[model samples]
Target chain A: STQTLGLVVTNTLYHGIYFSELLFHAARMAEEKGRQLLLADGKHSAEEERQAIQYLLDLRCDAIMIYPRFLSVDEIDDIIDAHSQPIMVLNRRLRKNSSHSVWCDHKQTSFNAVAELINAGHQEIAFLTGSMDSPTSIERLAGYKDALAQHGIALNEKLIANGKWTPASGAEGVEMLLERGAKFSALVASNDDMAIGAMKALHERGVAVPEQVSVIGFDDIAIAPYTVPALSSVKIPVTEMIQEIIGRLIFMLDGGDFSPPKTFSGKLIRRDSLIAPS
Target chain B: STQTLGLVVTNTLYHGIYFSELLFHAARMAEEKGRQLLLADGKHSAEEERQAIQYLLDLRCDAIMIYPRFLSVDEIDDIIDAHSQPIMVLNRRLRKNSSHSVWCDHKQTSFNAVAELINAGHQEIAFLTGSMDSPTSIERLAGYKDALAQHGIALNEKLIANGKWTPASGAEGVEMLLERGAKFSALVASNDDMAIGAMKALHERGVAVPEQVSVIGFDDIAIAPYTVPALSSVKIPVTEMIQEIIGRLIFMLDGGDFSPPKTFSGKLIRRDSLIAP
Candidate 1:
């Protein structure tokens, strides 16, 4: 007669602070409601992560919370179509699905970050992005283009580079932008790791951050504060997002109608990584 | 028709590189052998870990690999008695159980660490330990006692402190040792976090490491090399442990008898944390 809630997240060791913090807060909230919780890490593999979802379904978990880092919208739809249990996807939104989802505004955060850089007199800015196909990347890229359009800045294809959301890729993005003869006063990365990577590249090239080119990164990881220049990043509202997700789940558990998808905003944490153009 | 292996380990965020590495290697091996892997975290609670074990058994995993951080041997035995599925407990050996286990010798490693400090002319060594009930703590404490007795050093009850295998408790252990007027030439912490904590405490007291008092810790974590002064500690062979466990699991899957429990040795990774008198 014991009811248990299951959570399937990305690799905890390498998922960065955001995913882990999301899981941590979710676990805390689940505990508070007197429900037993079981967590599964996807280990950064699509097959492994999906199997976790299937395993949880087989386990008959009352409900499941997933990060969906590797699942496609079609795949998510397939999971929903196959299961009777309630599943709430975390972080990125699905293209279309009847299941519940709780995510932050990836596009708005990037749009605002680009706007902030523009306000600081940074007309020539490069965007270091995630995978081209990822919803997070696509939405953020749209936001960047929208910000440029709003300011009457012509979009330059040469200024954008796709990365795998790693620090190394961040460096590569900067290097590629430089190699393409692109001139920029600031760089905005899709994530903090890439931002730090970009900074490292700039440092190696003797370009002073915020002096030669300012940088902004996403996902305020734990090491953001300890970086050489300290990192300027967008802090995702993990706690609030989890709270809303838990609220939705509990409401559904109590026979309430499934609530519409809720969206939260990420706030920018301005640190040493940003500066005005001289 | 697929073989799925279930693994239940500690909270990955705080469990550090050891458990994660073990799982990484295990998952890799499982994939190489054409098997699927499902992992669960115990969230660092004893009751929760036990529940995880129960859940895995009910999920009818082909086999289960456990870190056994929180489950007692009898509790593990109870699961084995109730289920027909093969379970292999890793890292820590159960006191008495028919379930298979592959563990590094915590006692031997602790003894070696203490012996190394003693050889460095550290007579007044303080022991910062983990939870008393934990088999790891119990075995390592036995090793500490054995090392002190082997050296004919009188055991000082006041020189020992129990931590939750955390950095904060490592700091607290040093304070308790100093408050009790127990002067120690060196300290042996149960793990790296505690060792770092002890060094932090000493640093706050304006004491120089290796120059003032030597320190040794267990679990050669990834950050061990990057610590303020590189850490000297024990390294459990996670790869070897998992290989052996997987070997046994494969053997059992092939209709082979359950292999006898295996034991491993943790090597000493001496770095800047140790110096002779």
Candidate 2:
């Protein structure tokens, strides 16, 4: 064993909180297992992500963990089939390949958040989504529609706004919904940055939070508690999920059987951001 | 050339904002140079930092950049003398070793901040410092004292509070100063987290920010602008500094002469937190 583990992450700069926590825990776990962890930035490009994987493979790393953003399932499957070294995918599941994977249930988590709003007597709920091409965003949007369907409420296209996963786009999403005259008492953002943006926009428009409008955000970032009125967010169990994946990877390297694909659920953290519609 | 550049960082978890920026820029620079950047965590221990260095050296990395937290100057000097590959130190300067280095002038920045308060008619200025052992903290404290001396103000021990570079410690420092009945119209924290904590402490004690007391912090983190009063902080030119260092390292790797040590100054970002007091 080279006693070195490799991790490939999509641009740490853009997703600082999530990637930082992931790197911190992964390094600690690797150190505990008497190994060093080396990281490669994917740079948010499929070509760069592929090159990073190849770089780690060339380094003869004991095992490689990848959190890919742009690679397709077939592309990953092909890579796994071609490589002899163990490859574990993070934050996504593989369908064609029997590769090791640990993923969060984005669809289910989104469903639960929207369901919470429905239970709070909010009939018209608005959703802010990431770019349409992303699998994570697709799952989350599907989850939102599923919740509305389960509640016997028809989906309103005007209530949905597309964003670029930024605070600016989040605020713009709200403006777009409001300009379309879509009446929504509660809003769900795919991430905290967008959610925070939504809050700022509402405040600027003289709309009170949790009084006339309620809000919920995904990925409970560190600043969630410090935000004005605090932010209700979905807390993904990233540390636990990473630990489990690393443990299984090490076990397999020691001649143990390959573990089955694992899916973890996110818990909604209740803060001052959510309330029954006035 | 191995076409691989290595970087060693103190625990990224604790200093997320700074290290994240450092890593982001370093990676981009290496990519631009058609090389790969590999990272090793120093884990906040001298032993771990040394091991990380040796690990990179053994990998035959073309050059290594280190932002060490606990290693002494002599220890680093000895490593530079012993190693063949080019080593570039980040965020600190060395006296004995002539190794390439890029550092921010922590002392001078602190001096300027204190001078700003003095110019604003603040006579009694309280200082919040990080742990006593850190060189960064020591230089910042020296800057504070120098400013006070230049302004003909006596150094009052009661107004100085020691902290551990945390918001909790920052708040406690304020509590300690208040408990001792130290009268002051302005506060200067070594970092933003402590400054924020000080503001919270002042708020709980019924002191209006910039009305009764003014505050300034170091390292203008991302959330500084979003604070209730929009915190006043010192913005270090990290990206420019790192780019220069990496360029120098790459130049040296191509059989060029060694570059002299460089120091950069931080600019004070004026926000709603500071006022004449």
Candidate 3:
């Protein structure tokens, strides 16, 4: 029987670089292992994710990896309990579930970014979130608050704006912040697209980045260096992390011991957009 | 028995919006037809494409669609002949083999864009191509030449710059053309990314878009409206095109008659980048 590995992602085109790179790396690794990698896109829905998982299982994949966006931790835990084959979650860790997972510490990364801004003489920092529903957004938001509280800075609720993780929404978040008369010396966006949008909004408003304000973004995408003024961003080690996870999955398929949940950290890349707040 | 349709694309991340949209629409359409859509990324290799097809076949897919980037027409014909399952070629029509294909008319669209530039009083129009090996680049280049020839404008081979269908290569193509002393009042790129790169290169050289050099691009990507000058590009009806192709594939799977090769034309979207030169 031909061995196959299955991966279910919540939408390749939506999350941009991360999901695409994850798929690419997974396919390459599966090829290297002399196995075929089958993919099912969840399309950003819980039901779709459930169906995709079932479809992969029905296809008799030797092992399965899931990058679920809408599925709850409990649901994921139940999924692991229900499945006979070894299953690993990507980009999230379950507290109740003893399943294998590989994830980057979003909260730690966000805290580090905000702390850097604070260290650079920024007190009034506004945060652009990718809606509060997502665990990634919720965790990053907690990190922002954590950094401010640790630094003895009072958190202002008005300084936080929610967006749909798009460039347009990023611009709108900045607009919303300004409309509410929120004053800030720096802005931290959950992702690069939103950060770029925020910068564009700031530019249109005649606010000079790193001169009048500083901005930092996560997910240091491929075009980060090419943006006008060069965006300072957090670079997630997605390729290395995925490689590690896939390696573990392949090992586990050979009846090896299930590894504990592993967490990775991202490095903040300094660029022209970030500086001491003027 | 469960019904399934398979699609093999060259590279999703490499092609950007088009392939992604195609995949999304194909999946949705398959779902609507009560079937699952299986995908195989060819990874820009002929051997990989062959293997992907075989993998889908082994999975017992009722039908398969292919968006071949590297495989020759003859190779694709051979694959279709070898397979018992219904196979549909995408983005290209075969010459020797009778295969069902749904494609956008690249050459005609290129000619229309270049002719529009010509009508706007632009004589020396630069062409940025996506590698001469691709049928798309070749067709678009031919259209550029055809437009120039029909309008009685002499073809300047120096004006053509080859690119690898990337923004960086697009920038390098402009630099190469400038180094070769190729002068033009208008530029047409095979795709939006390359065109945007060309615009960036032109800006770096202190050349103003529309006022100095009118620029146009193909694919009319989502960011086309968001670019600095707002890129003018040709919009391929990908969603509709893919929906139609998937419908035909489903029909063919149910003992329906094979349809003739169909071609769709794209509309040139006017944006801030292009103007009368």
Candidate 4:
């Protein structure tokens, strides 16, 4: 009886580079350990994404790795409360649930981006968060506020806007910010798409990026650099982070009693989206 | 038995707009027929996209509305040949295997873009087709070439590039065309991503789009309008086409003998990416 590991994700297809890279890494690691790896297509709506994770858990895979599906605390624990199946979540954080969580220190990650903008002498800076509900947006927003407080810059309601995280929603955030007529020399966005939207708003209003208004974003997704002014962002070691979870899952499977949940760190990648401001 | 549609798609998550619109239309038709719907996730790799359709048949979907993941003629038939499910593929053409296909007339779509440039008096127009293998590219490239012939302009190999229908690949195509030292006053890409890529390449080289060279692309995805210089292209009616297939599938399930597959046409929407020469 060979043990299989079930990995669940939504939209692994057309996910471009990161997910494919994860699959390549997982396939190699499974081969090395002589384990059967099954990639279950968790192509469902927001609710179904979590359902797929629970479905895989019920199948009794030795361990499961998932993209966390933005599940509620209770929903996550429903799986944890049901059975301890050595589950590891990606992207979002889970707490006090006894399941392991691995994510970039997103707060710190966004803080680093703000510090870069501040160091460039940008006093009038704004924060463009992704979704108001997403844990990522919350974490990124907290970081932005903390950095401003440290520099004695009072956070203004007029300068902050939240995109629901889709491209269309991102465009809405850009519109919302411009409508407020808030003046900013730089902006730190929650994600690449939102950052791309910010760039558009600035460009349409004749705000020259990197010259008049520098723009930075998180999640160095493939589209980041291709933006007009090219976004400066955090380099999430997505593949390595997933690999680490897989490695730990294997360890847990073999009856190695590891400690509770853990956290991971990420790197900051600077690009031309930022420049010295007077 | 009450009916449910088993939707086979690449990923309904990223394709939220299609799902929302299609699901409404499918449910509307299903409502009229008093049938319900069930969506099946279709995830495929390489030859697996073809093989996955077999699984759809086993899942006993009333019909399989496919967004084919394969490019080769062999791959299309492989999936079509496998089962007896009423099939309608989106945005592609079928050759030897005759199935109901609801595809945007991509050639006509591209023809419009090409004509937009040609009428503007552009003699040399550059083309960046999606990929050499995808059928959409073949039809679009033909339209582009035909437009050149209509304008009495010669086709230049040095100006054309191939993209993998990706944003990054679109950008790369622009760089390749520029590096070849080709002279052209217009650019037509296979999709919005490629057009956006062309814009990036042009911006880097200090070329003003629609001033030095006009650009056009296909699909008109969400980011198309939000670009630095908002993209101009035809918007394929993905949701509308899916609605037709789902309606036809429900009709068959209602014992109307609509077992045959079908085709749905697409529309061309123009924006501001191109300026008359």
- By lDDT, the best candidate is 2
The Cα local distance difference test for each model comes to: 0.76, 0.81, 0.79, 0.67
lDDT of 4 by residue, A179-198 (tens): 88888888777767667777
Q: Please report, as a value between 0 and 1, the fraction of native contacts recovered by candidate 2.
A: 0.19
Rank by DockQ, highest first: 2, 3, 4, 1
Candidate 2 per-residue lDDT, tens place, A1-278, comes to 78878878566345525466666666666766767677676777888889878878988888888777787766888888898777888777777664477777899999998998898899999999987987888999999999999998999999999998887788899999889999989999998878878887888788888788899998887657655567899998887777767767877676566566466989889898999877
Which model is ahead, 1 or 4, in terms of lDDT?
1
Docking class of 2: acceptable
Predicted structure with the largest DockQ when compared to the true one: 2
lDDT of 1 by residue, A116-169 (tens): 999989999899889886778888899999999999999998999989887678
Instruction: Evaluate every candidate with DockQ and list the scores.
Output: 0.10, 0.31, 0.28, 0.16
Show where candidate 3 strays beyond 4 Å: A25-44, A97-99, A255-262, B1-4, B25-44, B58-60, B96-99, B255-262
Cα distance off (Å), candidate 1, residue B58: 5.7
What is the Å distance of residue B147 in model 2 from its true position? 3.2
Against the hidden reference, what TM-scores do the models get? 0.64, 0.85, 0.88, 0.76
Clashing pairs in 2: none
Interface RMSD of 2: 3.7
RMSD (CA, Å), candidate 1 to true, equals 7.0
Pairs of residues clashing in candidate 3: none
Better of 1 and 2 by DockQ: 2
